[PDB]
Amino acid sequence: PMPLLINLIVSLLGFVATVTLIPAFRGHFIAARLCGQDLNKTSRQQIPESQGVISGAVFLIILFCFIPFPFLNCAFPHHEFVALIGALLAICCMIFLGFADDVLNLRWRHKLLLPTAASLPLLMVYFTNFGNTTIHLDLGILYYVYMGLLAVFCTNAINILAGINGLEAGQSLVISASIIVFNLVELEGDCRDDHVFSLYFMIPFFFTTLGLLYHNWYPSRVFVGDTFCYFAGMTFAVVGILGHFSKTMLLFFMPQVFNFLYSLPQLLHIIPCPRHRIPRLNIKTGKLEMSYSKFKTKSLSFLGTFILKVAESLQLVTVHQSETEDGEFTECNNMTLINLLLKVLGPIHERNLTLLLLLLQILGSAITFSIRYQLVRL
Amino acid sequence: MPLLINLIVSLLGFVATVTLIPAFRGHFIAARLCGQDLNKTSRQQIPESQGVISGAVFLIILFCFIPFPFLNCAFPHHEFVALIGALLAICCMIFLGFADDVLNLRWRHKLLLPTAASLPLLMVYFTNFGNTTIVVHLDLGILYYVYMGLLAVFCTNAINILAGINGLEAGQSLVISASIIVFNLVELEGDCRDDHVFSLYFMIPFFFTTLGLLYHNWYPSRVFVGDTFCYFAGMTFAVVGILGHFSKTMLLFFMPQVFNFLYSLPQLLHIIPCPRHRIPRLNIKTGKLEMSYSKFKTKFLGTFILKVAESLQLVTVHQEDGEFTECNNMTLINLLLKVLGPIHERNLTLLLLLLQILGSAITFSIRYQ
């Protein structure tokens, strides 16, 4: 088809634009203090933050320039068009929200609320165009709720699985590429329009995020930040909702779902939650070791002690106990998939750990394809 | 029923703006998004880019209002896509303005990006209306679209350069928005009702959110609106004008801004040297704003333009190491100060708002009487 060919062309041009512009704007970001230190390395220099915006920006540009080509010599159908524009409005609002969130570092209340507001246009489009709120049970209003929350989830599910160089953009590239392959396979199948739409929004995302990862990859010269996390989350939520494969998509979100649940006791502050739960480097080794959350044992609530004991029993959390004059203490293992891989394999270098998590992501995607198409497993 | 709900949510949004602007002050100051009131003695920092909150609220409101018009209304996808496309243009303008303020992009970006962000407006205009003919009966064709594109840019920047005194940006934007609201209501009973009810949908919430912003921005300014609000407002106006089919009437409402943009044009083009700031210098003793000047070496076209201006009495010119010329900084503000001498900041803002209202009354008189 011509629309997809044109789309791929503008997407590669956008990849070049991203790789080019990211260094071109470095002075601006440094000047306005939109930067952060590399916590996992000994160096203390600043690195430009929220580079996702640039990719995001390019992304938007591309799609704005690509809208007409599907409708070439095509009573104009305003519904396909409104799907496009509504999805783009959702993504614009999510990019803007992530950029504002990186400049201001809003509290979690805002981080959860605002992606839902920004996902409303998605629900408008879904209701005017498709509207099928059935899974044989009719989910009704709940279904819309789901879609809303989906957006939030994605934006934040990628957001909390972060901290090592190239993980956010990397795992987002794996997810986007897997969704692209799924779209292509289904492209010959029953639902062609939904999946060609998913492609329209994925391909440029993949290539712009690739331009971003070029700089973000270890050693990280740039950081993607909440801008990229939110942007990616909403793009995925869009193609999943308006593509009608949100189940398959969430299956692709297996590492992120597992890490979000495994972190859930800390995110709810049942077990104390540090401000950063990244694996903290060992200066002698040069590799990343696990990171811990320490606290007075007595203060901990009953539910917290129960969850911690069950986790220790399952061999998921490392627990240490030490005696101090002021009070009794019990160290806990920071509960994030990264610290869990480090519990399983001990010290790992940053680049190798990122590669390992990308590998595990690919395994998750392969599992999803096997489920979808009755393939052989392992 | 739809307009009544629009007004309700717009007042709720006014409350939301007035409440949130101080709620987020900590965030803006902590992230160094602030600036010093150059025209006041104090040196403290004032939070910048507060138009991002109002703007944000604005978007929220409209996102929530979208359904009320289509209540049990072959769904009308064209009306719906116009609402969405306008919202998309406005989102990209709020976002681009906020990013511009944080990063302080060069003029190249400032001009290019509102055109890109205005493309969805042109797409909606082509799919829905597409009329590229004006009676003057000439089918402008592609140029028409160009116009619309540039219109966006112009507005976003036309309000942008007319700035620097407490409450001028949001104030003049409120006058323009209110004038367009009145015009929409007058034409509401006339031939074109849908266009003007659309313009109202977008204008009422903008008016009330911008009002919440001006509450804090008014002399003495406790906040600043910044490129965020300038871009946001400019694009909301360009939208309602384009998709409402009254961009000529609108631009007539942009009378002070057009005059100030053209009067500044020889400096903006660097024919006459242009300082980074061209606001009026406060007089320490007087407590009132006098004119400001650009000083540069006298030793081709620029000199002729300055002589012409001197003859016209629009620019005041005074002529060590070499001959230097202290030309009067060419902005409607410095021109009002050249006509009336020193004026206090609040009084000068009020005066420019009154002149804006005079321009709007002129526009109404031309159109109607």
Ligand SMILES: CC(=O)N[C@H]1[C@@H](O[C@@H]2O[C@H](C[C@@H](O)[C@H]3O[C@@H](n4ccc(=O)[nH]c4=O)[C@H](O)[C@@H]3O)[C@H](O)[C@H](O)[C@H]2NC(=O)/C=C/CCCCCCCCC(C)C)O[C@H](CO)[C@@H](O)[C@@H]1O
């Ligand atoms: C809580 C949490 O884990 N936050 C993360 C999250 O916190 C955000 O951090 C960000 C900064 C972080 O990226 C820094 O790490 C450094 N860095 C970055 C890359 C890199 O390669 N190397 C490096 O050193 C670098 O300095 C960088 O500035 C930012 O401050 C967010 O505001 C902050 N809060 C949240 O995400 C909220 C997150 C709220 C999560 C709530 C989830 C809600 C989902 C609900 C869905 C439900 C309805 C289904 O990210 C951090 C890692 O990037 C984690 O350490 C931190 O723990």
Ligand SMILES: CC(=O)N[C@H]1[C@@H](O[C@@H]2O[C@H](C[C@@H](O)[C@H]3O[C@@H](n4ccc(=O)[nH]c4=O)[C@H](O)[C@@H]3O)[C@H](O)[C@H](O)[C@H]2NC(=O)/C=C/CCCCCCCCC(C)C)O[C@H](CO)[C@@H](O)[C@@H]1O
């Ligand atoms: C050149 C110029 O005049 N710049 C302005 C413009 O410059 C922008 O400044 C901005 C900040 C400014 O708002 C400051 O004013 C201060 N302020 C404001 C009120 C107040 O009460 N107190 C206070 O202190 C406060 O500190 C604040 O930081 C910003 O940095 C832009 O990058 C900067 N450039 C442009 O707009 C470019 C604008 C590009 C103009 C070209 C557009 C061409 C349009 C073409 C359209 C055509 C197709 C029809 O705005 C300034 C604000 O007054 C002016 O003084 C300044 O002179």
